[PDB]
């Protein structure tokens, strides 16, 4: 119904799914999948991954 | 050379295997399968060739009745109402070679090869073979062959 | 009542050689190609060419190719050793496997 969205990849999370990492200060980073979470452990950012919707947006693709 | 039985001949023929290098307990099993059909009658020779060639292909199987411990249970032995069975190939070779010679002996006496029936097959044990197996601690242990003697006697039916 | 037939296959080797040990991949390729040909054409004797063998072992024994094209000829048997047919199996050199069906091969 209502559908919160991923912090990393900007995808949609239909309910009963994913995971909400709360940071040290308390920004609640939502994820879809272990792909997202374990790149947030390694501290690789969305902007450098080509498949992500962020790199898509910044390099004149989509919209 | 000294058979166990002796048709007044004319109507019967025989072959003997003096001391074959096979396992006694495995040849014992093949020979019990060949001896009769599923009924009480004595089995035809054309059937027992057609059997022993198929046991080498592993399509029919030999039921091990007497010497069981510890033979694995196969579906092909349902044929004989018996759970355990096995495909002794080298044993089927020497028994096929003997029946081959037993039909050759019939061809001199000029009777129907097509009508022949297995009157009596029997396996005896034979004198042992000696070898050495070496055990830990310097012990020496015997390793021994068990060759066997195979009689076959055939005749005409009718 | 069998008759001599030549026809073509592609064998999914990745499918055949699944869950199988790393020092038995390329051998147990050629057992299953022999058993495939043997089951397909109903024939005991199955010769396979050295250029099929060579292609399969190109990988090195564990990295076997995913697909192979293979054409399989049942042929009449000199004085015959029991059975009067023999199968024989050949490599087909092929650039891509995109819609290639189990076709017949004309002479």
């Amino acid at each position: 119904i209502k559908t919160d969205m991923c912090s990393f990849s900007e995808y949609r999370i239909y309910p009963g799914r994913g995971q909400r990492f709360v940071a040290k200060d308390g920004k609640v980073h939502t994820f879809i999948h272990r792909k997202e979470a374990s790149l947030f452990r390694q501290k690789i950012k969305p902007v450098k991954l080509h498949w992500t919707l962020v790199w898509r947006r910044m390099n004149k693709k989509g919209g | 050379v000294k058979y166990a039985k002796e048709s007044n001949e004319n109507k019967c023929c025989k072959a003997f295997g003096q001391d074959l290098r096979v396992h006694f307990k495995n040849t014992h099993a093949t020979v019990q399968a060949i001896k009769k059909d599923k009924k009480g009658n004595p089995m035809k020779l054309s059937a027992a060739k057609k059997f022993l060639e198929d046991v080498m292909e592993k399509k029919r199987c030999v039921p091990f009745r007497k010497f069981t411990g510890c033979i694995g249970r196969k579906a092909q032995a349902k044929e004989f109402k018996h759970t355990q069975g096995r495909w002794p190939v080298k044993s089927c070779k020497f028994v096929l070679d003997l029946l081959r010679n037993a039909e050759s002996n019939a061809e001199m006496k000029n009777l129907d090869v097509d009508n022949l029936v297995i009157e009596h097959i029997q396996v005896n044990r034979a004198p042992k073979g000696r070898r050495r197996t070496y055990r830990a601690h310097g012990r020496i242990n015997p390793y021994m062959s068990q060759p066997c003697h195979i009689e076959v006697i055939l005749r005409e039916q009718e | 009542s069998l008759q001599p037939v030549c026809r073509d296959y592609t064998i999914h080797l990745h499918k055949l050689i699944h869950g199988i040990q790393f020092k038995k991949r390329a051998p147990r390729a050629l057992r299953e190609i022999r058993r495939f040909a043997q089951k397909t054409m109903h024939t005991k004797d199955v010769r396979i060419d050295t250029k099929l063998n060579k292609f399969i072992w190109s990988g090195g024994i564990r990295n076997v190719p995913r697909r192979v094209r293979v054409r399989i000829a049942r042929r009449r048997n000199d004085e015959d050793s029991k059975e009067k047919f023999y199968t024989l199996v050949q490599h087909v050199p092929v650039a891509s496997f995109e819609n290639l069906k189990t076709e017949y091969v004309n002479e």
């Binding site: 119904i1 995808y11 949609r12 239909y14 309910p15 009963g16 879809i32 999948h33 989509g62 | - | -």
Partner: protein, 369 residues
């Protein structure tokens, strides 16, 4: 000597021995008791297990989750309609129950008839051919027996697994008891079902506790640890996935209570599992009041190991098993049971993002041919 530290037992002795049962479908055992008072109805069903997916519903319990939106795991069970065939009387003797006379229908399909052969492809398919000419020449001699005698009556029904996407065709035959009033009218209920498909909505309803019979999924010969739930031994000569001490010296014998190695899974086995949705194969099954988007309860890429395009039922064994359901032995009211169900959202998405395949096509856009 006593034990040292008195722990409870590993595993129940209730279920023993732990061996694979002789049956692929669940045999029912113990139908519910007869009220000569209700109308006549069937008290059981058969269906095939598919796969399970979560659903969102609003709780109506003062819990802290009152008026909140809870995700719940939910099994889909494929249930195409069971065709009634026969009927069976049962005399009550001092030994037990005892079958007096089975009557059968005129015309069975090849779906039902496969059950009676182990080799269908060979046979000339003779089953109920002498019976069918005997039926046209019917059985109101033998039905009069069941009205006169016989405390208990059971309809013989059977499945339709050609309609399922199992490669089956063979179809399970099953006795189902009839619990209403008057022994004549039980037979009149059964007679008029002959060669009629009974649907699932005839039996079960939304918001109902069901007792689920089946067989557990097999794991072969498993050891003590997995099979009985036993402590793993410390890092031990010989090995450490096993019990150390079987037994005391006396009795000079191993007791049956000690746990051993052997079979695990394929055991015949629940009660109080709520039905959320009865569906229809005839679109908008997974559609609700809230979401209003056109769906079927097949997820994308099938249920893994596929489709479902029949009647089904959700609720709170392995895939492609024949489950049986049962109507609960007493009609019970526990607040937890007798609950208002409200489904907001059924999921029909390896790791799926999108609910429908046209939703995926919108996201990726014009792809390359």
């Amino acid at each position: 000597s006593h034990r040292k530290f008195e722990r409870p037992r590993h595993g129940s002795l209730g279920f023993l021995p732990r061996k694979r049962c002789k049956r692929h479908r669940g045999k029912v055992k113990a139908f519910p008791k007869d009220d000569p008072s209700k109308p006549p109805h069937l008290t059981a069903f058969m269906g095939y297990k598919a796969g399970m997916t979560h659903v969102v519903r609003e709780l109506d319990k003062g819990s802290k989750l009152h008026k909140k939106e809870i995700v719940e795991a939910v099994t889909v069970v494929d249930t195409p309609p069971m065709v009634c065939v026969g009927v069976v009387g049962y005399i009550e003797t001092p030994r037990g129950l005892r079958a007096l006379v089975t009557v059968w229908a005129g015309h069975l399909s090849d779906e039902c008839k496969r059950r009676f052969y182990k080799n269908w492809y060979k046979s000339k398919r003779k089953a109920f051919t002498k019976y069918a000419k005997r039926y046209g020449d019917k059985m109101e001699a033998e039905l009069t027996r069941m009205k006169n005698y016989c405390s208990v009556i059971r309809a013989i029904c059977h499945t339709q697994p050609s309609k399922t996407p199992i490669g089956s065709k063979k179809a399970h035959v099953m006795e189902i008891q009839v619990n209403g009033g008057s022994i004549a009218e039980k037979v009149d209920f059964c007679t008029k079902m002959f060669e009629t498909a009974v649907p699932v909505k005839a039996v079960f309803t939304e918001g109902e506790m069901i007792d689920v019979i089946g067989v557990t999924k097999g794991h072969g010969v498993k050891g003590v640890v997995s099979r009985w739930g036993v402590t793993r031994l410390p890092r031990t000569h010989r090995g450490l996935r096993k019990i150390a001490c079987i037994g005391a010296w006396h009795p000079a014998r191993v007791q049956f209570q000690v746990p051993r190695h052997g079979q695990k899974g394929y055991f015949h086995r629940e009660m109080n599992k709520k039905v959320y949705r009865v569906g229809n194969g005839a679109p908008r099954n997974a559609t609700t009041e809230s979401d209003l988007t056109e769906k079927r309860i097949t997820p994308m890429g099938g249920f893994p190991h596929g489709t479902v395009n029949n009647d089904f039922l959700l609720l709170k064994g392995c895939k492609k098993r024949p489950i049986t359901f049962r109507k609960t032995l007493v009609p019970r009211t526990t607040r937890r049971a007798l609950e208002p169900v409200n489904l907001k959202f059924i999921d029909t998405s390896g790791h799926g993002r999108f609910q429908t395949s046209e939703e995926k096509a919108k996201f990726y856009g014009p792809l390359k041919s």
